[PDB]
Nucleic acid binder design. Structure first.
Lengths: 78, 94, 136
RNA sequence: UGCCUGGCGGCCGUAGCGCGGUGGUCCCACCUGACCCCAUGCCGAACUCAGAAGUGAAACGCCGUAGCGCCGAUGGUAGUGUGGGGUCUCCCCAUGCGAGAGUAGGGAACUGCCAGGCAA
RNA sequence: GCUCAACGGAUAAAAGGUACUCCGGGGAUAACAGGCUGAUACCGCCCAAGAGUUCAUAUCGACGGCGGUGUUUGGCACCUCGAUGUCGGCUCAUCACAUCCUGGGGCUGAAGUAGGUCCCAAGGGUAUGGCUGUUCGCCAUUUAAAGUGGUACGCGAGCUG
RNA sequence: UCCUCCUAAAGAGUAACGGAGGAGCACGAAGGUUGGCUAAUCCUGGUCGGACAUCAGGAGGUUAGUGCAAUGGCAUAAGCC
RNA sequence: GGUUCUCCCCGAAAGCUAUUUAGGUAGCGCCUCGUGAAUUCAUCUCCGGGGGUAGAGCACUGUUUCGGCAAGGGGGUCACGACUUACCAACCCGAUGCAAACUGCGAAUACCGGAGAAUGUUAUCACGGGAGACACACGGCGGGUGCUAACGUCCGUCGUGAAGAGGGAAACAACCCAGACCGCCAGCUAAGGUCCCAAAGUCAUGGUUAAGUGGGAAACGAUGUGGGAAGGCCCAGACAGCCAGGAUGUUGGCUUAGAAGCAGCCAUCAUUUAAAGAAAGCGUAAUAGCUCACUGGUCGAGUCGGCCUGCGCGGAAGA
C-alpha cells in the first residue's frame, strides 16, 4: 500500500555544551535550548534562542534558586 | 506464645540476600522505638508455617535473637510473587 | 472481546515483556487466579476463559478481571511483501508477567472456586496457579 | 540584651493550607475626605492626594492544633556496569553501584542587616 | 526576476513503442527448482459448552489452548543470468506412512448382514472410457480397492509438443 | 526541501516505503519601550435570556492563553490592556 | 576480463554528506609517509557536572476495572402539571492495573571538564605527498519492523570475519580459547577433554537415573522414583478387604397431569437410633432396583490426601 509518515528534521544539536566548572571565555555558548529550561544567572546572558552565553571568562556552576527550583546558570569568576 | 528463633545478619545486599534465600532461610528486620534497627536472619519453613495462623499477623510476637527476647508485631511482608514463600518481613519493635 | 475505547494512537511498538508483575496480592476478591508463566492474553482469550468460568459458578457470586488488553497487535496480510508500512490492527493483547493475578472470585465456596479456575485456565496460553486472599 | 513591629534579603513546602484562639499606646491594615496633583475604556473601587474620628471586623503578624500537603530512614525488591552460565521471546552466578513505591518516624520552618516601639 | 518542489538547481527549450530487436554487464536483482522460515495450508492433541429420545467423551465436538509436518498459498533473496530447458501426456519408476484394498484388534447409541470410530501393520495389490492442452474436475461403467504424498511440483544428453 | 514529537538505548548524533502531525506565512502592530492587569470551567443570584451573551459574588487555580503544527518555555509573565 | 621478479615495515574501509545519484564520484571519517609541537593523549582514583532512559509511579495527558455517594439519565405511571419508579451513570472518595509519542520520582553506565600517580616506541594534534574505500557479514546487548518468523530487514554499540592462520564445537568464514619472525624428535598451560577409533582417570568419595534418559520438542496426563516441609485419621484400635443394616410417614410441594431419596425451584428437616445423606451415581416413563456412604463385628499395624523440589515416562508421524 502506501505510507503517510517519514518526515522529520535536521536534529538541532541542542543541550549543554560547557558543563560545570569548566572555564569559558566570555561570549561562549553554554546551553543551546528550546525554551528557558535553564535560566540565566550571574554573569551569564540569555540570547534570542534561550542560549545562555557566558559573559566573563570564568567557570560555570548550575544552581536552583527562588521558589520554583529552576536550574540556574551562573559564572564563578576566575 | 509465638516464638521464632532468629540470628543476626552479617552480610547484606542483593547477593547476600539471594544466597541466604536459597538456603531455606530469609532475612527480616526489627525496627522501631528509638534504637538501632537489628537485621534479623531466620529460617523460612518455620515462619512460612507460622503465617498460616491468623494470629501471627495481629498479636504480639517474640523473636529470640542472641539469647534475648524482643517483642514485635508484623508490619510488612514480601511474598514471592509466584511461589508460596516469603522474602522479607518488617517487624515493628512493640 | 474486551477492547479499549478511543485510544490515543492506533499503532504502538512491539516492546519487551521483562520484569515481574503488579497484581500480586488478591485485593477485590477472596480467591484469585495468579499467573506463573510469561505470555500474553488476547481479548478472545480473556473472554473465553470468562465464559468457561462464569458457567461453573452459576452466575451468582462475583468475578473481577484484573487484566485489560490496551495494546494493539498489527498483522500483515497474506501474499504481501515486507515494508510498505506497519500492518493493520487485528486484535488486542494484555501483557502478563509472572505473578499477575488474572481473575478473582468471591461468593462461592473454596472448592467450587477451585474447580472453576481450572476450567478457565485450560483456555489460557499461560501457566497459572491458584491463590487465596492472604491477610496483609 | 530581652520581647513586639516594619522595610530588604538568605533559603525555598520539615517553610503550604485547613481549623481553634490572639494583638492596636507603637507599627500595620481597613477607615475619613477629595475642589484640587493625578486617576477610571463607567465608577476615587483601584491608582493618587489631603488628613486621623473609628475598629482590629476583614486582611496581616503571632500562638496552638496533624486533619491534609510536604520531609523521610534502615532492611528488602526492581534495574544495571564488567566477567562467566542456562531447560536462552527470558533469567541466573561472582563483583561494583543500587532506586521508586511503601514503613518507622520527623514535622505547624529557620536566619542575617537596618529602623521604630516597649521593658530592662 | 525561477512551486529551477526531481527543492546542492544537468539545457532557455524534451514524450512514448519495440513480440524486429541489439550491445555491455548482474544471481549486486525477478520468473523455474533448491535453501531458511512456517504466517498460511494440512495432520494430531488439550479444555469440555452443546447435540446425540436421558447421558459431554458410540459419534460430533463450540468458545479458546498446545504442537507436528514441509505436501499448499506466501515471506526472504542464500546458490545458479560466461544458460539449473517448462505445463500436461508417454515410458520406467522409487521411498515414506498420515493404510484406499487385503490382514489382525479395542469400543459401539454393534442381534445377524452391513457399518461408524479408533489403534497395529507398508508383504503384495491399487480402473477403463467420454469432454478438455490440461493436472484437477465432471460423467458413464467397473473393481477387493480405484489411497495420500516425497522424489528439480521424479523422469526432454529417454520420447512427445 | 523545511519544521515538531517518538523510535533514539538519560551528552550530541542515529536508519527503514518506522509510528504521528505541520510549513512554502502572517503583522507597520501582532514590532519597541514605559505603566498597569490575571486566566479555563463549573456554582448561585439576576429583565427579556435558553445548555451557553452581559452583570454580580463564590469555588477553582493556569485544567487558560500564546497570529498557525508539535515540543520546550512563560506570573518578573513571553499571556491581556 | 587480465595486469608478469623478491624481501622488509605499517596497514584500512564497506561510514556520514552531496550527487538525473544509488554498482560511479567528490569532501570528510578511518590508512600511510614526512615535518613540527605542547606530562598532548589513553587507562585509573578523586572531584565538579548536565540529564530523564532501565526501573518505578499514576499528580498531569489518555486508557482501565470494582464498590460507595450521586447529579443527571432511563423505564413505566398520571390528569396546566407530574406519580410510582426491575434500569444507564459524569465530578469526587476508597481500592486496581497500563503507556514509544504519560512524569508530582529516578538509576546503572556513557559523556564533558578539572586535579594526581603509574604505564604505554607521541600512543595526541596540526600541516604537506600518496592512497584505497563509500556492496559489508555474523555474534552479544538495546530496539524498530516481521509472526517477540527467517542464515530476513533497518539503525545503535562491542567483538570476530573481511584482511587471522592454530587448538576446540564430528565436518562447520563469521561461535569458544588464542593472535603464526625462523628453527628444534624440548617443557608448561587455555578452550575442550581422559573406555577403544583418538593423546590423556575404566581416578577417589557421595547421591540420582531404568528411560539408551543422557543422545530433539509443548499444552496436558499419570499409585515411575529420590530428598523436604507440614497436616488428618491411629494399637481407648484406623486404611483396603470380609457379615448385617443401608430406612419410617416425604404419592411432601410444582403450573394443582407425575416426578416419588436420586427434575426444575428449594429450604437442605425432624423423629426412629449402633447407624441412613428428604441422597453421590448407577434404575427409571414417573416408581420399583442394585448401591456405597454413615454403624458394629472381624482384623492387626500405620494409612490416606494435598504441597514444595531432583531426575525420569507418555503426548512423539516422512519420504
Amino acid at each position: 500500500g502506501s505510507t503517510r509518515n517519514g518526515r522529520d528534521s535536521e536534529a538541532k544539536r541542542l543541550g549543554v555544551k560547557r558543563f560545570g566548572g569548566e572555564s569559558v571565555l566570555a561570549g561562549s555558548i553554554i546551553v543551546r535550548q528550546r525554551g528557558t529550561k535553564f535560566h540565566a544567572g550571574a554573569n551569564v546572558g540569555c540570547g534570542r534562542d534561550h542560549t545562555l552565553f557566558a559573559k566573563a571568562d570564568g567557570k560555570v556552576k548550575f544552581e536552583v534558586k527562588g521558589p520554583k527550583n529552576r536550574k540556574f546558570i551562573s559564572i564563578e569568576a576566575e | 506464645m509465638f516464638t521464632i528463633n532468629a540470628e543476626v545478619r552479617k552480610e547484606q545486599g542483593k547477593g547476600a540476600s539471594r544466597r541466604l534465600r536459597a538456603a531455606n532461610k530469609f532475612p527480616a528486620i526489627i525496627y522501631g522505638g528509638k534504637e538501632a534497627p537489628l537485621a534479623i536472619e531466620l529460617d523460612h519453613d518455620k515462619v512460612m508455617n507460622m503465617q498460616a495462623k491468623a494470629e501471627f499477623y495481629s498479636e504480639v510476637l517474640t523473636i529470640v535473637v542472641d539469647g534475648k527476647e524482643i517483642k514485635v508485631k508484623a508490619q510488612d511482608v514480601q511474598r514471592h510473587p509466584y511461589k508460596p514463600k516469603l522474602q522479607h518481613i518488617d517487624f515493628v519493635r512493640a | 472481546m474486551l477492547q479499549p475505547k478511543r485510544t490515543k494512537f492506533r499503532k504502538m511498538h512491539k516492546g519487551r515483556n521483562r520484569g515481574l508483575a503488579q497484581g500480586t496480592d488478591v485485593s477485590f476478591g477472596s480467591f484469585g487466579l495468579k499467573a506463573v508463566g510469561r505470555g500474553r492474553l488476547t481479548a478472545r482469550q480473556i473472554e473465553a476463559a470468562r465464559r468457561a468460568m462464569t458457567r461453573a459458578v452459576k452466575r451468582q457470586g462475583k468475578i473481577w478481571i484484573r487484566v485489560f488488553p490496551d495494546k494493539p497487535i498489527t498483522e500483515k496480510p497474506l501474499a504481501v511483501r515486507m515494508g510498505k508500512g506497519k500492518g493493520n490492527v487485528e486484535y488486542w493483547v494484555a501483557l502478563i508477567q509472572p505473578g499477575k493475578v488474572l481473575y478473582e472470585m468471591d461468593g462461592v465456596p473454596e472448592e467450587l472456586a477451585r474447580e472453576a479456575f481450572k476450567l478457565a485456565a485450560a483456555k489460557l496460553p499461560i501457566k497459572t496457579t491458584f491463590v487465596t486472599k492472604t491477610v496483609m
